[PDB]
From a paper:
Beside the cysteine-protease activity, facilitating cleavage of the viral polypeptide chain, PLpro has the additional and vital function of removing ubiquitin and ISG15 (Interferon-stimulated gene 15) from host-cell proteins to support coronaviruses in evading the host’s innate immune responses. PLpro is required to recognize and cleave the motif LXGG within preprocessed polyproteins between nsp1/2, nsp2/3 and nsp3/4 into functional units for initiation, replication, and transcription of the viral genome. PLpro folds with a right-handed architecture consisting of thumb, palm, and fingers domains with a catalytic triad consisting of Cys111-His272-Asp286 and a N-terminal ubiquitin-like domain. Four cysteine side chains coordinate a zinc ion, constituting a ‘zinc finger motif’ that is essential for structural stability and protease activity of the enzyme.
HE9 binds at the surface of PLpro adjacent to the binding cavity with ligands HBA and YRL. The interaction to PLpro is formed by hydrogen bonds of the dihydroxyphenol edge to the side chain of Glu 70. The calculated binding energy for this interaction is −6.15 kcal/mol. We determined the binding constants for the ligands HBA and HE9 using their quenching effect on the fluorescence for PLpro applying the nanoDSF (nano Differential Scanning Fluorimetry) method. This resulted in Kd values of ~400 μM for HBA and 1 mM for HE9 (depending on the emission wavelength used). In particular the two compounds, HBA and YRL significantly decreased PLpro activity by ~73 and 70% respecitively, followed by HE9 inhibiting to ~55% in a deISGylation assay; while the inhibition was not as pronounced applying Ub-Rhodamine as substrate. Further, we determined the inhibition efficacy by performing in vitro IC50 assays, which demonstrated efficient inhibition of the three compounds namely HE9 (methyl 3,4-dihydroxybenzoate), HBA (p-hydroxybenzaldehyde) and YRL (4-(2-hydroxyethyl)phenol), in a concentration range of 3.76 ± 1.13, 3.99 ± 1.33 and 6.68 ± 1.20 μM respectively. The compound HE9 significantly reduced viral RNA (vRNA) replication among the three compounds studied and was further evaluated to determine the effective concentrations that can reduce not only vRNA levels but also SARS-CoV-2 virus infectious particles applying a cytopathic effect (CPE) inhibition assay. Importantly, treatment of the cells with the compound HE9 reduced the viral replication and showed an ability to inhibit CPE with IC50 = 10 µM. These results from the cellular assays are in line with the in vitro enzymatic studies using deISGlyation assays and clearly demonstrate that the compound HE9 is a potential inhibitor of PLpro, which can protect the host cells from the viral CPE. Thus, the compound HE9 could indirectly attenuate the viral activity by reversing the host deubiquitination events linked to the IFN response deficiency in Vero cells.
Numbering used by the authors:
A (entry chain AAA), B (entry chain AAA): 1 to 315
Write the structure that this text describes.
Amino acid sequence: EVRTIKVFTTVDNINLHTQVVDMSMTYGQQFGPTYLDGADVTKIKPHNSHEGKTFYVLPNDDTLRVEAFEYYHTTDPSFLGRYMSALNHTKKWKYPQVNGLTSIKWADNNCYLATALLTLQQIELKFNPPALQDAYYRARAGEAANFCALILAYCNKTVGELGDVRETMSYLFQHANLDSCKRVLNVVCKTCGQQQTTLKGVEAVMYMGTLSYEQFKKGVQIPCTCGKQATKYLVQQESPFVMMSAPPAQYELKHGTFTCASEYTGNYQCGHYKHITSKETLYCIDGALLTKSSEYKGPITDVFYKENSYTTTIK
Amino acid sequence: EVRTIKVFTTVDNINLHTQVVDMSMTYGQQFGPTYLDGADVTKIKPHNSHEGKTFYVLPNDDTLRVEAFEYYHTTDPSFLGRYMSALNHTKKWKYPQVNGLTSIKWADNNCYLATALLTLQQIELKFNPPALQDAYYRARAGEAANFCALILAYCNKTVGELGDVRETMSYLFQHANLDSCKRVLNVVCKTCGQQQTTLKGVEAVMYMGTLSYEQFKKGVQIPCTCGKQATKYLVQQESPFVMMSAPPAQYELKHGTFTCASEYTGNYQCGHYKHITSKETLYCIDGALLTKSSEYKGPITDVFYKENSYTTTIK
Ligand SMILES: COC(=O)c1ccc(O)c(O)c1
Ligand SMILES: COC(=O)c1ccc(O)c(O)c1
Ligand SMILES: [Cl-]
Ligand SMILES: [Cl-]
Ligand SMILES: [Zn+2]
Ligand SMILES: [Zn+2]
C-alpha cells in the first residue's frame, strides 16, 4: 500500500514547488538534503503532520539555482546547508529589546553578532540581497533569528565560533549598497613627496589603524617603502558613516563625539565583545545586559561616526 | 639542563620576529598555534634542525595584528590556520605548464581552482592584498602552492570541498582593483516603463543569467514585480573584461568570440570543471590534460570576454 503527502520545496521560503512524497522513503532519497525550519530531515521519512509544510532543499535544478542566486546573491554550494544549520540554533536564541534596539541574549559566543546587529541599527545602510533585506526588516522588529543565521552563513562562521566585528561588518558591507561612498587620502613622505589615493564603496567607509576620526583627519604615521615614516590623512569623505578600527587598546569614548563602538576583552583565542552607544548618556549593551556611565574607557576595537560630506583644510 | 634554539616567528613570511625557544616545551606552550611551511607543529618540541627557521604564528600582539591585516586584508581570526592547513596540501600538488599557462594536476576536487587560475592568467586584473600580489606572481611563474592555499582561505573552502567557479571569482574580484569598472543597465516593462541602473566594481563585470555577451546587449527576459516579463539590456560598459554566468546548460563556444570559459559536468553534490580557451584554436585544459577542437559544445557555466568601452545603439 503506497501512501503519499503533498509538501512544498523551496530555496527562498517565498517560491513554493509542489511535491508529492512517498511516506516509505526518506526526504533525502526523494529531494537530497532537506530541512524543516532549520532541522535536517534528510534521514527522516514523511509524517502526516508534514502535509502542506514547506521544506528547504538545495538548488538541484535550473529553476531553484536562479531563485537561490536572486534571493541570496551567492552560488556557494554549501550556503543553504550552512544557513539551515545556523538557523536551527538562532531560532532558539532570545532577542530582547535593549534601549530601543534589537539585541541578542548571550549564547554560543554570539557577542560579536550582538554588537554588529546593534551597530547596523544605528547607521544608514541598505542591503542588496533580498534575503538580507527581508531578514533585517524582521530583525529590526525583534525577530532576528533568520538575520543572525544569514550573517553566520555569509561570513562562513558556525554557531559557537569566535568572530571578529570588523571582519563581520566587512562581509555585510560587501552585500550593501555603498556605491555612493568615496574617500580621498594623501600620503606625505619627506623623502618620496605626496601620493593621493581614491577609495570607493566598502574601502571608502572602513579604516584599520586608528580609532579616532579626528586623528585620521590630522594624519597618522605609516611605513614608506623608502624606510621613513609617511603621514596618511583624510582629504575628502562622502558617506553616511565611517568605521575606524584598530587592535584593541585602552581608549576613552566621550559622549557626543561618536555614534557607537565595540569593546573586546580577551585574547586571539577567546574573548568577549560589548557595545557602547552614545545617546542621552553612554550606554553599554552586553547582549541582554545594560549599564550606563557619563565617561567610558575600555579596550575599544571599532568606532562608528556619522558623516555626510567632509573636505580637509590641509593644503 | 636548559637548552634553547633561536627561531623566527612571522605572520607574512617577510617580517621576522626573533624568538628564543626552550627545547623542553612544545611550540604551542610558547607561541600558541605554530606552523612550519604549513605543518602544524603546535604539539611538537623544538628540534636542532629548527634553529634559524621561520614559523607562522597567529597574530597574538598588536605588531602581528597590524602586519597580518596589512599583508592579507582580513581580520578573520581563523584565517592563518586555514591558510596553513590548505598550504600543507597545496605544496604537494603539481602545477604543470599547459599551453603556456600555469594549471593544476587534478587532486582533492581542485578542478574549480585550476579553471579559476587559468582564467586569471587570461584577464587583466591586479590584486589589492600584498599576499595575493606576491603569491599570484609566484603562480604565473609556476609555483602556485601559496596562491592556491590563499584562494582556499579567502573563499572559506577546505582542500577536498566542492567549489563553484563563479563564487570563487567573486571572492578574488572583491580583493582586486576593479574601481574603474562601470556598467549601465536598462529594464523595460511594457506596464511599468523603463528603469536605468548603474553598477560599479565587481557588480559591473559579473552577470548571472546568460552566457552570451551579445544576448545581454540585445536584452534578456526577467520578472517584474507587476507579474509581466521585463527586458534587461546593457546600455554602457567600461571594464577590461566581463564575466557572463549561468546554470550549466549545453552551449556552443565559437573560436574568436570569447576569451575563455568554464564547463561543469555533474550535479549539485559533485561534478567536474574543465577550462576552454580560445587561441589559434579551441583548447580544453582539464588540469594536466589538454585537447583541442575547431568547435565546442558542452555544459558551460561561465564565459569571459574582452572589453574596453561599449555604448549601446538602442534608443
Ligand atoms: C552579487 O550579486 C548581485 O549583485 C545581483 C544579482 C541578482 C540581481 O537581480 C541583482 O539585482 C543583483
Ligand atoms: C580591505 O582592506 C584594505 O583595503 C587595505 C588595508 C590596508 C592597506 O594598506 C591598504 O592599502 C588597503
Ligand atoms: Cl535593507
Ligand atoms: Cl597582482
Ligand atoms: Zn618615502
Ligand atoms: Zn512591470
